[PDB]
Design an enzyme around this catalytic site. Sequence first.
Site, PDB file in Angstrom:
ATOM      1  N   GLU B  88       0.859  -1.176   0.000  1.00  0.00           N
ATOM      2  CA  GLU B  88       0.000   0.000   0.000  1.00  0.00           C
ATOM      3  C   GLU B  88       0.899   1.231   0.000  1.00  0.00           C
ATOM      4  OE1 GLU B  88      -2.348   0.971   3.399  1.00  0.00           O
ATOM      5  OE2 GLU B  88      -4.075   1.658   2.260  1.00  0.00           O
ATOM      6  N   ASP B  89       0.565   2.241  -0.812  1.00  0.00           N
ATOM      7  CA  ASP B  89       1.391   3.441  -0.825  1.00  0.00           C
ATOM      8  C   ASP B  89       1.304   4.187   0.504  1.00  0.00           C
ATOM      9  OD1 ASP B  89      -1.273   4.104  -1.286  1.00  0.00           O
ATOM     10  OD2 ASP B  89      -0.806   5.476  -2.939  1.00  0.00           O
ATOM     11  N   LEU B  91      -0.653   4.324   4.593  1.00  0.00           N
ATOM     12  CA  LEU B  91      -1.440   3.696   5.646  1.00  0.00           C
ATOM     13  C   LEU B  91      -1.769   4.775   6.674  1.00  0.00           C
ATOM     14  CD1 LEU B  91      -2.398   1.408   7.606  1.00  0.00           C
ATOM     15  CD2 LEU B  91      -0.021   1.002   8.147  1.00  0.00           C
ATOM     16  N   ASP B  92      -3.058   5.008   6.913  1.00  0.00           N
ATOM     17  CA  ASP B  92      -3.457   6.171   7.703  1.00  0.00           C
ATOM     18  C   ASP B  92      -4.434   5.731   8.789  1.00  0.00           C
ATOM     19  OD1 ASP B  92      -3.767   8.862   8.540  1.00  0.00           O
ATOM     20  OD2 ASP B  92      -5.338   9.255   7.044  1.00  0.00           O
ATOM     21  N   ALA B  94      -5.949   2.989   8.668  1.00  0.00           N
ATOM     22  CA  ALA B  94      -5.770   1.525   8.595  1.00  0.00           C
ATOM     23  C   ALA B  94      -7.047   0.785   8.193  1.00  0.00           C
ATOM     24  CB  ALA B  94      -5.232   0.948   9.910  1.00  0.00           C
ATOM     25  N   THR B  96      -8.471   0.579   5.242  1.00  0.00           N
ATOM     26  CA  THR B  96      -8.312  -0.137   3.976  1.00  0.00           C
ATOM     27  C   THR B  96      -7.562  -1.442   4.184  1.00  0.00           C
ATOM     28  OG1 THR B  96      -8.252   1.962   2.751  1.00  0.00           O
ATOM     29  CG2 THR B  96      -7.430  -0.042   1.632  1.00  0.00           C
TER      30      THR B  96
HETATM   31  N1  3L4 Z   1      -2.604  11.454  -1.479  1.00  0.00           N
HETATM   32  C1  3L4 Z   1      -2.793  11.232  -0.077  1.00  0.00           C
HETATM   33  N2  3L4 Z   1      -3.825  10.315   0.394  1.00  0.00           N
HETATM   34  C2  3L4 Z   1      -3.997  10.093   1.832  1.00  0.00           C
HETATM   35  C3  3L4 Z   1      -3.184  10.754   2.735  1.00  0.00           C
HETATM   36  N3  3L4 Z   1      -3.566  10.360   3.954  1.00  0.00           N
HETATM   37  C4  3L4 Z   1      -4.566   9.508   3.821  1.00  0.00           C
HETATM   38  N4  3L4 Z   1      -4.842   9.327   2.536  1.00  0.00           N
HETATM   39  C5  3L4 Z   1      -5.887   8.455   2.000  1.00  0.00           C
HETATM   40  C6  3L4 Z   1      -5.267   7.253   1.312  1.00  0.00           C
HETATM   41  N5  3L4 Z   1      -5.848   5.937   1.563  1.00  0.00           N
HETATM   42  C7  3L4 Z   1      -6.557   5.686   2.809  1.00  0.00           C
HETATM   43  C8  3L4 Z   1      -5.612   4.760   3.554  1.00  0.00           C
HETATM   44  P1  3L4 Z   1      -6.390   4.261   5.146  1.00  0.00           P
HETATM   45  O1  3L4 Z   1      -5.363   3.558   6.013  1.00  0.00           O
HETATM   46  O2  3L4 Z   1      -6.863   5.544   5.794  1.00  0.00           O
HETATM   47  O3  3L4 Z   1      -7.546   3.311   4.855  1.00  0.00           O
HETATM   48  C9  3L4 Z   1      -6.407   5.231   0.435  1.00  0.00           C
HETATM   49  C10 3L4 Z   1      -5.662   5.600  -0.841  1.00  0.00           C
HETATM   50  O4  3L4 Z   1      -6.636   6.144  -1.681  1.00  0.00           O
HETATM   51  C11 3L4 Z   1      -7.046   5.245  -2.673  1.00  0.00           C
HETATM   52  P2  3L4 Z   1      -6.035   5.676  -4.184  1.00  0.00           P
HETATM   53  O5  3L4 Z   1      -4.689   4.995  -4.062  1.00  0.00           O
HETATM   54  O6  3L4 Z   1      -5.860   7.185  -4.232  1.00  0.00           O
HETATM   55  O7  3L4 Z   1      -6.777   5.137  -5.413  1.00  0.00           O
HETATM   56  C12 3L4 Z   1      -2.108  11.719   2.240  1.00  0.00           C
HETATM   57  O8  3L4 Z   1      -1.387  12.295   2.986  1.00  0.00           O
HETATM   58  N6  3L4 Z   1      -1.943  11.916   0.840  1.00  0.00           N
HETATM   59 MG    MG Z   2      -3.427   3.022  -2.892  1.00  0.00          MG
END
Ligand code: 3L4
Ligand code: MG
Lengths: 183, 175
Positions: B88-89, B91-92, B94, B96
């Site tokens: 995963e690019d 993780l915030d 968590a 997803t």
């Molecule tokens: N570009 C960007 N996106 C952020 C950031 N923080 C959370 N996100 C939302 C990204 N993600 C939420 C991760 P979580 O652990 O909260 O489930 C999902 C990535 O969004 C889907 P995609 O790769 O943009 O198609 C950030 O700093 N920059």
């Molecule tokens: Mg992604």
Amino acid sequence: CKYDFATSVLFTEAELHTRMRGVAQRIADDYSNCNLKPLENPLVIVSVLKGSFVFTADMVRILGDFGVPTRVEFLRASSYDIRGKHVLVLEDILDTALTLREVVDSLKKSEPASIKTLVAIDKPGGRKIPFTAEYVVADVPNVFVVGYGLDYDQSYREVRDVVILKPSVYETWGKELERRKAA
Amino acid sequence: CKYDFATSVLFTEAELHTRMRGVAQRIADDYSNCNLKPLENPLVIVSVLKGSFVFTADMVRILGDFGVPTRVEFLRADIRGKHVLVLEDILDTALTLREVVDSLKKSEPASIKTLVAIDKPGGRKIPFTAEYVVADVPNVFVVGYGLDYDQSYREVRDVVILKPSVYETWGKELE
Ligand SMILES: Nc1nc2c(ncn2CCN(/C=C/P(=O)(O)O)CCOCP(=O)(O)O)c(=O)[nH]1
Ligand SMILES: [Mg+2]
Ligand SMILES: Nc1nc2c(ncn2CCN(/C=C/P(=O)(O)O)CCOCP(=O)(O)O)c(=O)[nH]1
Ligand SMILES: [Mg+2]
Ligand SMILES: [Mg+2]
Ligand SMILES: [Mg+2]
């Protein structure tokens, strides 16, 4: 050869990147009259999974260097909102052209402003229908290659170079698959 | 700062690659006892679309340099008995990765671990620890290296903090 599983290296990572910079300059010039901008009007990159992911990752970064802002979408090759947007379809390899013919025809239904194709590897001697990609990074002859996203049965996509797969690899594996089927 | 649209560059492409080599060495060591092999027993890389495609492209090539053979699958945000590494690019919260990992676990992989480019440890909405993290980010909004703002800026080579005026004007433009 650098790789036990290959008989020849055809294009190294560096050669491909050099060719991709040349292609990116052409793309930058060709779309200069389109007023592409992030958010407002990016070039829509339609990446055909799975193998195109490596080429797409490298090419959008090079396109960015040349001032071409993009937005990416992913289509699955196994299945084979751009209305008013410029679309560039990216494929790792173009061979019979059956896949890209169908992908382009499908996207055309959504009335993009324009649609073009960019392929990393063209096998011009492989066609089953007439098809020309607007942009081609490299041509290969009718040999079976892996690397730079291209697989043999899902492996070897991570090889950094495009290489000719050594025949004992698929002879060995093919036999194992057939042995597993009978067992 | 090099970019018109960014207040600062957090991690350059070269710094990310250096960290990824460190992580790849740990992954190679951690999976050495698994007898991974192309075709017969690759490490299954499950890449969470869209933003993880850049990280995944770079990371599988580095893993290959370290002798870790892979095969890739893409999941949109045949594994029974295989080792799975979810990439995963970012993780915030968590939420997803929790859902992705739990759904994969129903197919009974041999093992399942997670590797993220960017961890925002202070953003959790449930407890979650990734096995491998390339870099940590605090409470800031970043783009680049696959990470977008409304689908743009994924192609930026570095992880950068987006200038507030960018999403202020765009948010106002989406009238
Ligand atoms: N570009 C960007 N996106 C952020 C950031 N923080 C959370 N996100 C939302 C990204 N993600 C939420 C991760 P979580 O652990 O909260 O489930 C999902 C990535 O969004 C889907 P995609 O790769 O943009 O198609 C950030 O700093 N920059
Ligand atoms: Mg992604
Ligand atoms: N690894 C490898 N694959 C090759 C090759 N030639 C055709 N293919 C199959 C490519 N496929 C057909 C292209 P066509 O124009 O004939 O419709 C497209 C890619 O296959 C799907 P995936 O990327 O492996 O998931 C080759 O030389 N090496
Ligand atoms: Mg493909
Ligand atoms: Mg294939
Ligand atoms: Mg996003």
